[PDB]
Amino acid sequence: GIALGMIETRGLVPAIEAADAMTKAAEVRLVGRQFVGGGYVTVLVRGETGAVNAAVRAGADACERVGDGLVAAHIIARVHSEVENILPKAPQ
Amino acid sequence: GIALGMIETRGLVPAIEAADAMTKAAEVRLVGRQFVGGGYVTVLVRGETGAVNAAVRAGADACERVGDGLVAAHIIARVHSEVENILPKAPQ
Amino acid sequence: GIALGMIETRGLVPAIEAADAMTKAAEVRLVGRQFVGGGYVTVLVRGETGAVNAAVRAGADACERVGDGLVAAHIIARVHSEVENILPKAPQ
Amino acid sequence: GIALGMIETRGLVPAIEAADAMTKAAEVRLVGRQFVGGGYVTVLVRGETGAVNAAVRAGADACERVGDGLVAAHIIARVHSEVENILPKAPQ
Amino acid sequence: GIALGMIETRGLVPAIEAADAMTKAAEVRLVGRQFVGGGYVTVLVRGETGAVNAAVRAGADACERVGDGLVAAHIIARVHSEVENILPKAPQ
Amino acid sequence: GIALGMIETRGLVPAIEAADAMTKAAEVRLVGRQFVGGGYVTVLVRGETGAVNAAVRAGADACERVGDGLVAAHIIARVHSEVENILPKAPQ
Amino acid sequence: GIALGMIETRGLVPAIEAADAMTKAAEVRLVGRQFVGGGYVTVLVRGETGAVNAAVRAGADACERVGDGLVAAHIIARVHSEVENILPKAPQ
Amino acid sequence: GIALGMIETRGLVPAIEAADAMTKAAEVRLVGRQFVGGGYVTVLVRGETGAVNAAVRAGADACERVGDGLVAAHIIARVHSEVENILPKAPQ
Amino acid sequence: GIALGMIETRGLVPAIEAADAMTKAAEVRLVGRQFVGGGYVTVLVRGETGAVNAAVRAGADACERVGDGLVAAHIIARVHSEVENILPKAPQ
Amino acid sequence: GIALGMIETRGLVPAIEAADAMTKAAEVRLVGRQFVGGGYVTVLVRGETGAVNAAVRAGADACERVGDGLVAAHIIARVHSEVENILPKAPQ
Amino acid sequence: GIALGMIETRGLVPAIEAADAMTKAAEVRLVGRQFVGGGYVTVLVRGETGAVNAAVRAGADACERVGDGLVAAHIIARVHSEVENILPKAPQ
Amino acid sequence: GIALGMIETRGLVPAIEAADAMTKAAEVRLVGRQFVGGGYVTVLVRGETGAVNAAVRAGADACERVGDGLVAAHIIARVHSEVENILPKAPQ
Amino acid sequence: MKIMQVEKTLVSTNRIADMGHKPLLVVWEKPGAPRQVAVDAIGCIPGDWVLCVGSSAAREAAGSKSYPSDLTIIGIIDQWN
Amino acid sequence: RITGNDIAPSGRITGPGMLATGLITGTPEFRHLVCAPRSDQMDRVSGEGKERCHITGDDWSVNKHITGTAGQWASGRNPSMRGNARVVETSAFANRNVPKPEKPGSKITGSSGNDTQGSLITYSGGARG
Amino acid sequence: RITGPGMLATGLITGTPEFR
């Protein structure tokens, strides 16, 4: 899909809860989990616009109080083709 | 079992204490320890939902006062297949 | 374009909004995203001085309320040859 | 499309207007109409996430003023393999 | 013969009066009488749009006073192929 | 005879009394008894117009105070061939 | 005996208490139990008029405080032949 | 056994709680579960008079606070031979 | 596992939402959905006691405010063999 | 019968008084006498539930003032199949 | 099932009640009843962690007021292989 | 290891907690469990001095509040060759 | 009033709104006679002899004194021809 | 009072145990209009984007926490300056209440279909027709 | 009242409460 969902969290227990509630909710594919350093983990899902909005609204409510917490929940429905270069395609 | 229990702690000594506590307390398998960054270390232990609750409660109490302490104790009774790729399969 | 616009942000969710906001706002090319470490992620764009300026203002405004925020927004109208070697270049 | 849209109504006239508006608004296949009992009739549609969001909204607006009315309008973006067996496959 | 008229009523006695007023009023074919449950009985008719309008308008006035009265009188002039599948084809 | 006399009641005890009164009061055939749901039970009679008028009148006064009472008492002297199909042709 | 005694109740537990109380109270035969829907259950007994009068009075007093209670108690000493076709001949 | 124990409950979830408690408390046999309609479900158990007094008490307490609750609880130490024909012999 | 979990709801939409949340949250198999009548639908899951405790907690919270809501949520960790004949083994 | 009666007493003298009173006062069979250690004896009986209740009530009355006394008098109307392994089948 | 639940009580009347309650409450297997001496009887029941938490709580509530009462009620979710040599395999 | 770690406990349940805590906390080997009589149950371990010390402290703390409690917790760093005859060589 | 037999129903979607929702029926004194339309107060099946009232009486028989009707089917004749 | 390993629900540990406390029964602890009035609402996006109906479940709505495609993100991108108020409009609708001279009156006699209650027909010169 | 073996040991017996 073209939409991007991002759930930054302070810790990987909050990020794992977020990825579980984002994937389970809608047909969004978990394209990456990034250790941004400093303790910030960003779980990135890519799917159709509605699926990403439904998924990112579930992940956020789920990880809001897991561990340290949620830092950011952001949706970008189409992303400049140049930004697609700096976005993960499959999770490590 | 397919349930997931994760304990996040600030430091590796608290996390090793938590992992030993969890595996000894109930029938769970240590599947990995991840260095998140910023001094966060997450110990992941799979197993049956009831077994994974006992382990995460036993391991949460063990690391509560070891070192910097406990950031998160969390249980996910079923894990979506998408989040399996991000989770560590065996401990390294 | 030789002007460089750079937006440092605390996290990658704040940085993908700004890379997306800078690229959409003006004729700048996203040369790279660099993880400084400590939670710092820097998105660097390259364009004519007038285009880098609109893009940096747009990126600075967008990411300021996404996640932890904006650390620095800066424009260098002419970048010296020696600094080009320390600057990300390819749209990798 | 795997999403489920469901409109529960009091009566069958509201349900058939709900099912017409839902099928009329988007490319969603009407998979069932269920006489729940108590005078409740749940018409179930299935389609791509966005189609089911556009469909359910049209059906809810269409049936609220038809007959006794609407009890519920719900979307499930991905339904578990288990809930497929309690879901009608093609309508009766 | 592609238009649908429906008159839901609380009880069979108002609905039989509605179906008698509808079939006599215009050239429509009572395609079904459906016990929805909870005491709702829906007489559905299928004929050209003017005929269906006359039948449902006359049937609605006829059943308003009989018994517990009318719940709904509806005309769906064009019926989506999908909604046709949840519709009675002959009265039984 | 072609006339129909339908007495709906909230229960089977009122309907059996209504049927007894209708059949005894005039020469009508108890073509059917139907359980609509919600407690509604309609006893339908068929005979010549005068016979049906007398029968429905007797049934109504008879069942008004029997049990939860009368919902409707209706006479249609000539029922359409089309509504003949939704009417029971023999009691069970 | 050709009289009909009928006790409608709101539930089968009130109706079975009424059936037991009726057969034991007087010389009456339990011809049927019918689920009318809406929670209504009718127990039809048949014997001599005085027997039925005594049974219906005994079954009413017995079932009034069992569960939701009694809706109707009714006796029909002679039943028109037509009403016999809607009456239950044997309890099963 | 000769005794009957009937726990009528509003909803099936309270009825399965009542059934589990009775059959566990004393030596009784679930002989039927009846959907009386209108949300009424009656669980009938046949056993020895002492066994059916102990099962009904257990079931009534258990199902009281489960779901909508308990409509009635009743023991008929012996049922007239005629009420045996309206009684369920084995559960469906 | 032989544990039972049962979420009764007013309508099919609340129950289908409850079955999605129950199945996704924990390792439970959906053994049946039963229309109890009177507007009530039961959704029954069977799993190990910890998985069924987690499933009925997830379903109850998700369907509480979907449609008319949740009548009951109940766990029976072991069911008497007798109650197994009144439980649905596989769903439709 | 499957019901179990158990009278525990301090000493075998109270136990034999109670054992004789239980088997002389009801149709129960002495299935065993177990020395529990510590100056406790248990006399276990088995019969229909009313018989066991009368037997245990009679024995508890007989031994309350015989010797050291009665510690417990308990009735378990149906014992689980697993408890039947730890229960004596015949005395000596 | 490798979790161990164990209820010590003063007497075999308090212990048999506890064994019955524990085994009835969850899928646990009574592995032994031991006469510890001094009038103490330990009923040990194996099973999955969730089932042993249900069963031990049921046993404790059940035997608390039977006879002398409950000495202890303990759960061990996993037991070292060494301690498995001092634990009963099946009841003797 | 010739050190011995003895934890005497009132009851077997305080003694099985002690054995579990002891064997889990050190390289000790449960050598036996004794029912001393009167209630006392002595769990004995054999290991090195530091291992035995760690195991006994853990066991005492663990079983102190389980049931009646801990009678004694003793460590004998080297046991005389004569005492070996009175010590269990393997758990029987 | 005139004894007339219903032949067929009549539908006019573009009808004055003052004719309400009342049904219209093509009555005739005998077959092959001038066809007329009557607002059906008493529901009537095609082929049945009916009785129809004309000026003023029809307006009140089918709704109110203002109802636009100069012919209304006042009843169905129990036995005719 | 039950010693040993605890599987009882807590707030320090997070996950499925916390959900639905006080709704569920059978637990070891227990045992031992959809659409807002149409007149009141004025949806931002009409049609299939209408948010008037409370559509429960996994819908495409975004809550407080979500930041993204709309709002400051779409409105900030391009600079803009609004410099004037709406100026009076010249349209048929606006001219509905234009000051008009007094209606022509008809003093003609003799049958001429001289209706005075209808719409203002005019004849050459502005007379009443 | 109803005399019999059920009358005996009113407050001592525990377990299997019967119908009120």
Author numbering:
A (entry chain C), B (entry chain B), C (entry chain A), D (entry chain M), E (entry chain G), F (entry chain L), ...: 6 to 97
M (entry chain H): 1 to 81
N (entry chain Y): 701 to 732, 773 to 869
O (entry chain X): 712 to 731
Sentences from the study reporting this entry:
Among diverse BMCs, carboxysomes are specific CO2-fixing BMCs found in all cyanobacteria and many proteobacteria.
Intriguingly, the smaller T = 9 shells involved only one conformation of CsoS2-C, whereas the second conformation of CsoS2 appeared in the larger T = 13, T = 16, and T = 19 shells. Further integration of a full set of shell proteins, which naturally yields diverse homo-oligomers and hetero-oligomers, enables diverse interaction modes between CsoS2-C and hexamers, thereby facilitating the assembly of larger midi-shells (T = 13, T = 16, and T = 19) with a maximal size of 54 nm.
